[PDB]
């Protein structure tokens, strides 16, 4: 019922301060609150969407770990950027991880990543799909450093998130407090569930597809944290706080300038790693995002608003179209098929009213009308052409 956290929309401790959030759960997406699953209500950081604990042992069990337990579910804990021992703020860490993950669950749910779509909850409450798969949220996980990860089994088995301590800076930095990292990881769950249907989570394995797998997560983090005062000239890094590097962890900033970020589809012909390929894809989606935010407006709301089934603003419209595309694209998608799934998602959602804005963005970075995956590791033909008749 209270969570002392960096609030949603404040990516990390360099962007703002912590605040006590009272009952932030969305009543439709989290009908038992975050503290309940319809069997019981907890005073620990556990409930329908997530089971969060300090997994110091780094193992596969979440029942042998310390978890905060607060009377009244008032998770109000100290946190200092000067503390050198991360275990001293483990309660704040677990609370922040639980908060961000639950908030993201609630947003995704409103956008259609719900029970029947293959989402992550203990009790689907009659809404379809398979339960017993609330995300296991391992704060200060002992099994690694300077990273984070997510494991996605088929619907009905839990997704598992592991958040590590990053130690290239002193004091060390806990990536529970970098919301974009949590969002990136959780999105691995989303895209693996949606792509090829919720029973099949081996659909994003081929290099180009795993590349999009990385890019969707970066994209969702950047989109969530887009600010109303931003213009399309704004650039965003990935993980600049957790990595203690103003340029972030990717090779270029997310940017609508081809000079700042020169990546196009042809760039993938000289790439061999999912994280560089994912930077290409998230940059393409950043272009889409700005076209649609300009057309439909920005927002800093936590939940979308709908005209019928269509989100009112361009931020949630982009995110909806991206998620809807994941559920339309084939297993092992190419960039081209992922593009076509997004455009087809807009045909279904708005009758194709955003075709021009979509194609302009895709064409700008080499995924225009003539673009082709080709064959082999270097066979891609990029294109800047826009189909006739759309604009
Ligand atoms: C859930 O949220 C609102 C307010 O809590 C209403 O209860 C409504 O029934 C649900 N919202 C939507 C978009 O369906
Ligand atoms: Ca454990
Ligand atoms: Ca499920
Ligand atoms: Ca539910
Ligand atoms: Ca799937
Ligand atoms: Ca809005
Ligand atoms: Zn990733």
HSE of 130 in the Cβ direction (CA atoms, 13 Å)? Answer: 13
8 and 74 assigned to the same domain: yes
**Count of CB atoms within 10 A of residue 19's CB?**
12
- Residue that finishes a domain, picked among 133, 168, 201: 201
- Residue that finishes a domain, picked among 152, 186, 201: 201
275 and 175 assigned to the same domain: no
Cα-Cα end-to-end distance for the chain: 49
Report the C-alpha gap between 119 and 154 in whole angstroms: 10
**Count of CB atoms within 10 A of residue 108's CB?**
24
Q: What is the DSSP letter of 236?
A: B
Shortest-distance atom of ligand 1 to CA 306: 13
Lining ligand 1 with CB less than 6 A are 27-28
Q: With CA atoms as reference, report the closest residue to 346 among 290, 283, 292, 279.
A: 292
344 and 221 assigned to the same domain: yes
CA 70 – ligand 2 centroid, Å = 20
Shortest-distance atom of ligand 1 to CA 29: 1
Report the C-alpha gap between 338 and 332 in whole angstroms: 10
Kindly list the distances between the CA atom of residue 359 and the CA atoms of 164, 369, 375, in Å, as whole numbers in the listed order: 39, 8, 24
* Exposed/middle/buried for residue 156 (C-beta within 10 Å: 0-12, 13-18, 19+): middle
Domain that holds residue 279: 202-391
In angstroms, this model's resolution equals 1.9
* Exposed/middle/buried for residue 360 (C-beta within 10 Å: 0-12, 13-18, 19+): middle
258 and 388 assigned to the same domain: yes
- Residue that finishes a domain, picked among 201, 236, 255: 201
Q: With CA atoms as reference, report the closest residue to 383 among 354, 352, 359, 347.
A: 359
The question of whether 185 is a catalytic residue gets the answer yes
Ligand approaching nearest to the C-alpha of 148: 7
What is the number of domains present in the chain? 2
152 and 245 assigned to the same domain: no
328 and 301 assigned to the same domain: yes
Q: Which one of 46, 185, 214, 287 is the catalytic residue?
A: 185
How were these coordinates obtained?
Answer: X-ray
Q: Whose CA is nearest to atom 13 of ligand 1?
A: 110
Whether the CB-CB separation of 332 and 203 falls below 8 Å is answered with yes
124 and 12 assigned to the same domain: yes
Query: Which residues keep their CB under 5 angstroms from ion ligand 3?
Result: 129-130, 133, 155
């Amino acid at each position: 019922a209270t969570y002392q956290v960096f609030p949603w929309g404040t990516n990390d401790p360099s962007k703002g301060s912590r605040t006590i959030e009272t009952d932030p759960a969305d009543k439709t997406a989290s009908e038992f609150t975050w503290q309940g699953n319809g069997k019981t209500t907890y005073t620990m950081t556990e409930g329908n969407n997530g089971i969060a604990q300090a997994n110091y042992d780094g193992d596969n069990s979440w029942t042998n770990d310390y978890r905060p337990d607060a009377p009244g579910a008032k998770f109000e804990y100290g946190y200092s950027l000067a503390e050198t021992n991360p275990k001293k703020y483990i309660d704040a860490s677990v609370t922040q991880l639980f908060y961000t993950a639950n908030m993201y669950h609630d947003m995704l749910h409103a956008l259609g990543f719900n029970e029947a779509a293959g989402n992550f909850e203990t009790n689907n409450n009659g809404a379809g799909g398979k339960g017993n798969d609330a995300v296991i949220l391992n704060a200060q996980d002992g099994s690694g450093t300077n990273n984070a990860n997510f494991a996605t089994p088929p619907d009905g088995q839990p997704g598992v998130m592991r958040m590590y301590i990053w130690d290239e800076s002193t004091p060390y930095r806990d990536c529970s407090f970098d919301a974009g990292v949590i969002i990136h990881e959780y999105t691995h769950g989303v895209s693996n569930r949606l792509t090829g249907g919720p029973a099949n989570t081996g659909c994003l394995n081929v290099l180009e597809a795993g590349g999009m797998g990385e890019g969707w997560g970066d994209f969702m983090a950047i989109a969530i944290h887009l600010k109303k005062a931003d213009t399309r000239a704004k650039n965003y890094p990935m993980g600049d706080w957790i990595a203690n590097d103003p340029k972030g962890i990717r090779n270029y900033l997310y940017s609508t300038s081809l000079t700042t970020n020169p990546y196009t589809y042809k760039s993938v012909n000289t790439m061999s790693a999912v994280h560089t390929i994912g930077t290409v894809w998230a940059t393409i989606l950043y272009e889409v995002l700005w076209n649609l935010v300009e057309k439909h407006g920005n927002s800093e709301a936590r939940q979308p608003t709908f005209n019928g089934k269509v989100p009112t603003d361009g931020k949630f419209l982009t995110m909806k179209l991206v998620l809807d595309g994941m559920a339309l694209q084939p297993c092992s998608p190419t960039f081209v098929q992922a593009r076509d799934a997004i455009i087809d998602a807009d045909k279904a959602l708005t009758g194709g009213s955003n075709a021009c804005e979509l194609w302009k963005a895709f064409a700008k970075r080499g995924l225009g009308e003539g673009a082709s995956r080709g064959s082999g590791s270097t066979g891609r033909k990029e294109s800047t052409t826009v189909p006739s008749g759309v604009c």
